[PDB]
Design a protein around this ligand. Structure first.
Ligand code: ANP
Ligand code: ANP
Ligand code: ADP
Ligand code: ADP
Lengths: 740, 490
């Protein structure tokens, strides 16, 4: 018809297996309501009946499409479908649905009331003939095929019908695949990297003939890496099985497990077999087993194997319908002659996930688990700092095995055997989650983390003008390069905080990285000391390579004065005013691109004994005095700390605010900690006294703090900063020369 | 190709190399090409097995045994000259040496002119922008950049517009152009810059970019430009020319600009070495790098070699008291030893620079070495107005503003201070203009009458309220000691 009814498929955000979400101007163009019965026609004359729903997440012309119904239509991602309303659907009297025997194995008991009757209630579901849907439960996920309906050829189902499920399972026909093949639905986290790998490879695989009409070379050597266990083979096979090409898998240890000429014949026949079924993808994992760093290679057959791989990958420039993906452990653990132009050009890091990614990975792995009601995935989302996803698979399987181990093993073996009806009753508790998270958790990470921070501007009290002109200093030229191009001034890229210790030096950097949606990689002082004492400075280049790879980002140096204080004070050691790591930092600083959005933030508390070679233009040049807090900042900081804890309202904090002057913010965030420790000790002792009183039940004495704890904490209080350091810093206010 | 010859067995590789040289003998005249020589003949210490030395000896015999023939010629290509076996590049085997090097902005413009030949650009695309904004790239990155922008123009418009209705032909490929937005997008992300090493190019700053300092410029022109054009006069009067010059002065007086102007006017290459390079060669105790630098310098003939912050190695191990040592170090005497052992006429002219002329080693002030001393003083008011206009020529400024008030007020100021105060005022003006822009946007709309494209007296007055001198008086007296005393030989 060539009208807007020809639409492009996508992934779905909805979690029902038969609903389709669409946008508002599109749905106002088609004149429907919510919950209408809609019909989809695609390729090879297949049909889909669905419920339509409305969402603003959809764009102008796309369709949020589920995987089981897109495999029901026998189409894939990148195909076009046709949309028609079918508003004349009645109810049925008999429903014929039956499994395929290849996915129901080990199963005993009745199948009908355990799955079908928990499914076909309360959801009027549109079913057409020959359809295969998918349900979960029983620690499993089973698909189901329908055969016959009374209102031919489709109906909507309701509580007011029956389903006749009689018969034996039927073998799967030759055309479709199973649904235990992995896909785009079961990879939690790292959505941007998946989008980048999706957009980089879509054209020569979905439209191969276009590059048979245009001679422009696509990128063919694309290399992803990451710390191990993160499922690089999983995402590789997911992209290859989702976009629909021929797959073949070369693993490094198997090729090293043969003789010499047998390995040569294996690699040659593998590349010929990948040539035969074009278009196709090819995958080499554990490249460290095949082509290591050259200094770590000692024999003779290994260099011959690496030269064989170089000739075999240079000799497929003529072909353009295969593409090579590979996976190592680290980019510094490959031979440097391999990753060059014509062999391996594109580079992508997977990285470790974060709390949102951990929540999504946990949402993947409790899909067919049948949780309880008291289990709280936000708890084990926030309490699981520093983990990879295979540890999360181990954690979920460990909690499931603990629920099998405590109740229902010895309860059942004394009387009967085990079926799936009692597997329906099995849920797991949060106690097994806390038990599997307390012990038996080998945390597989000690390295540097990269994430967006969470502290916002309202978490720090006051300091308002400094926040707004820092916002001027970073936020402006990334949004308006035309004004700077008009006035010809290149922007500065350095800023140097300084101030007395204990004034909240990390919080403003966290707020700037959180508001502009920037990554964050921090380096403390102890990292500088363990890079100085070991005399190892081939690590700074790795840090700034990671920084450029995490573009955009803000790089935070904490305790820069440690290397100048460590070898003596202001007299110092026998040396002078320079060192090793700081000039290595300058040399790797000034030799990079101006527009790459890597913004370097330094910090110290001793601004006099620092090397003045860092205050050159083109480097760190912006100085901001961070002073002691004032009383309005004191009440603001005190409320911003006390917002987490339950406090009383009759207590008054302006007495101590008007009393305490010249105090660090760290002191006024530890005195509340001291008072709350005193209150928690008082409450637990009154708890054990009322327990031992009549019983040798819960009327809580107080959930908050009174004036007594604050008065005793002020009797335990202490200032942290002397007056002479304030005069040493106000020397810079009196003198004002700060260029060099 | 090297990897293919290493991909066989031993006698098969021998038969392959022998049949290759016989086949190159058959169709004389012909050329022959061996790339990735690092795969065939590496450095000898990195070779460990047995068949590799046999292969290298086979190559040496096979190239010595074609001296009788004269109708073939061998060209080869490695990665680095320090990564070949040293027994290979000798007389009778490999005599001539030529560096390709990295291109520059003119070369980048020409390479981009190569790769948009059949591209059908738009009208708004500006190749000068991505010529000047692409510092530090090789040409394969430029091929990747042009193909990436073309793939982005295929990815945004015309993929999903076309697949919903019809198929793809070339009549719609005629309508396809690319925009500059895809160029900025492919240049912002997905640009692995493949270079960190030293660059060699002609500079662009001319004599009019620095204000005043006229007599010093003309007798420096006497010092460098004269004997390359008139060797007959020096041969007549028998004096060999000096080849060293030592700038010195207080910090912040434009020390790099005169060196850039001399290298730009006489059409000379330029290789500079800052102070941090001297510190990372001293602390690591690695001095097999100076010889590489002067080999690159002789290979870049003619050129001018610039040392910046020479006083870093004398200040780094203590001040004028120093460390436990004395008045010498390691890198500077290595510099002297590689300096005096080279040809007089090779047009390698060495320019040194410091800001502390007293604590430097006086062994460098010998004849046949750096001997010419030029006091670079503080700017004067005519140099102040000249330097201020030479900085402000880039920015749009108003004409009713007057700069001679602050010029007659500011005395004893560095040129760096009077090129950052304009930067501070223009940051203040760009903040004022962007806030008035967002206020007029949020005023009636919650269209473009520009309030001001230039600077008024208010920004300069506030920048003078934020102004600061950078040099004290006692350092001027410490330098004018050399004017009062005048002994400067050793
Ligand atoms: N509102 C606040 N005001 C001040 N400090 C705060 C505030 N909120 C949190 N902090 C604490 O301040 C820390 C930031 O370090 P900061 O206290 O400024 O350095 P420092 O204490 O002066 N030097 P040091 O403690 O030895 O590393 C954070 O880690 C918090 O523990
Ligand atoms: N007309 C000018 N007069 C003075 N300085 C200028 C002028 N034009 C540019 N400059 C700046 O002067 C710099 C040259 O270094 P220079 O300022 O002489 O060394 P220095 O500032 O005294 N010592 P340092 O800044 O610590 O490396 C250039 O990089 C420019 O930023
Ligand atoms: N983010 C994740 N999503 C889904 N599964 C994961 C994830 N991370 C780890 N896994 C599981 O951990 C295992 C590790 O992946 P694998 O391909 O074996 O990596 P490697 O071979 O490098 O250890 C996989 O079998 C996968 O099922
Ligand atoms: N200056 C240039 N002019 C034209 N093409 C270039 C240029 N630089 C790089 N290329 C492209 O980059 C690729 C790299 O050249 P190549 O011969 O493969 O070098 P190597 O094998 O040493 O990487 C070539 O295919 C070439 O088309």
């Amino acid at each position: 018809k060539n009208r807007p009814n020809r639409l492009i498929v996508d992934e779905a955000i909805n979690e029902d297996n038969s609903v389709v979400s669409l946008s508002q101007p599109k749905m106002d163009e088609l004149q429907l309501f919510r919950g209408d019965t809609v019909l989809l026609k695609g390729k090879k004359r297949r049909e889909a009946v669905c419920i339509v729903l409305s969402d603003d997440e959809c764009s102008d012309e796309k369709i949020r499409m589920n995987r089981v119904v897109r495999n029901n239509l026998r189409v894939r991602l990148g195909d076009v479908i046709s949309i028609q309303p079918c508003p004349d659907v009645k109810y049925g009297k008999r429903i014929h649905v039956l499994p395929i025997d290849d996915t129901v194995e080990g199963i005993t008991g009745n199948l009908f009331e355990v799955y079908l009757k928990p499914y076909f209630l309360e959801a009027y579901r549109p079913i057409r003939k020959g359809d295969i849907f998918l349900v979960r439960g029983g620690m499993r996920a089973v698909e189901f095929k329908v055969v016959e309906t009374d209102p031919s050829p489709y109906c909507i189902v309701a509580p007011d019908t029956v389903i006749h499920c009689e018969g034996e399972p039927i073998k799967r026909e030759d055309e479709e695949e199973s649904l235990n093949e992995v896909g785009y639905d079961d990879i939690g986290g790292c959505r941007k990297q998946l989008a980048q790998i999706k957009e980089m490879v879509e054209l020569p695989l979905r439209h191969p003939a276009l590059f048979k009409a245009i001679g422009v070379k696509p990128p063919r050597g694309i290399l992803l890496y990451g710390p191990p266990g993160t499922g690089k083979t999983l995402i590789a096979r997911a992209v290859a099985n989702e976009t629909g090409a021929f797959f073949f898998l070369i693993n490094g240890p198997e090729i090293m497990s043969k003789l010499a000429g047998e390995s040569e014949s294996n690699l040659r026949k593998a590349f010929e077999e990948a040539e035969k079924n074009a278009p196709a993808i090819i995958f080499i994992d554990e490249l460290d087993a095949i082509a290591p760093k050259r200094e770590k290679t000692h024999g003779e057959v290994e260099r011959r194997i690496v030269s064989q791989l170089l000739t075999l990958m240079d000799g497929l420039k003529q072909r353009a319908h295969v593409i090579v993906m590979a996976a190592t452990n680290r980019p510094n653990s490959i031979d440097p002659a391999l990753r060059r132009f014509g062999r391996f050009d594109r580079e992508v890091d997977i990285g470790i996930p974060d709390a949102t990614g951990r929540l999504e990975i946990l949402q993947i792995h409790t899909k067919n688990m049948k949780l309880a009601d008291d289990v709280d995935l936000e708890q084990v989302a926030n309490e699981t700092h520093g983990h990879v996803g295979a540890d999360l698979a181990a954690l979920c399987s460990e909690a499931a095995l603990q629920a099998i181990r405590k109740k229902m093993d010895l309860i059942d073996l004394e009387d009967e055997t085990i079926d799936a009806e009692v597997m329906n009753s099995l849920a797991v508790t949060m106690d097994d989650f806390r038990w599997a998270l307390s012990q038996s958790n080998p945390s597989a990470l000690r390295e540097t983390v990269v994430e967006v921070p969470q502290v916002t501007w309202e978490d720090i009290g006051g300091l308002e003008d400094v926040k707004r002109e820092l916002q001027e200093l970073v936020q402006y030229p990334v949004e308006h390069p035309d004004k700077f191009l008009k006035f010809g001034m290149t922007p500065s890229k350095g800023v140097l905080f300084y101030g007395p210790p204990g004034c909240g030096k990390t919080l403003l950097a966290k707020a700037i990285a959180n508001e502009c949606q920037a990554n964050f990689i921090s380096i403390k002082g102890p990292e500088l000391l363990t890079m100085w004492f070991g005399e190892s400075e081939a690590n700074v280049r790795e840090i700034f390579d990671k920084a450029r790879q995490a573009a955009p980002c803000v790089l935070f140096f904490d305790e820069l004065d440690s290397i100048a204080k460590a070898r003596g004070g202001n007299i110092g050691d026998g040396g002078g005013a320079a060192d090793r790591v700081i000039n290595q930092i300058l040399t790797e600083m000034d030799g990079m691109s101006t527009k790459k959005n890597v913004f370097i933030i330094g910090a110290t508390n001793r601004p006099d004994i620092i090397d003045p070679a860092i205050l050159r233009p083109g480097r760190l040049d912006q100085l901001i005095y961070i002073p002691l807090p004032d009383e309005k900042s004191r009440v603001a900081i005190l409320k911003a700390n006390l917002r987490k804890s339950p406090v009383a309202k009759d207590v008054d904090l302006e007495f101590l605010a008007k009393m305490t002057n010249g105090f660090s913010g760290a002191d006024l965030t530890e005195i509340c900690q001291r008072a709350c420790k005193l209150a928690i000790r008082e409450s637990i002792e009154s708890e054990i006294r009322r327990e031992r009183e009549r019983q040798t039940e819960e009327d809580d004495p107080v959930p908050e703090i009174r004036r007594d704890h604050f008065e005793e904490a002020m009797r335990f209080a202490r200032r942290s900063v002397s007056d002479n350091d304030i005069r040493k810093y106000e020397m810079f206010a009196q003198t004002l020369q700060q260029s060099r």
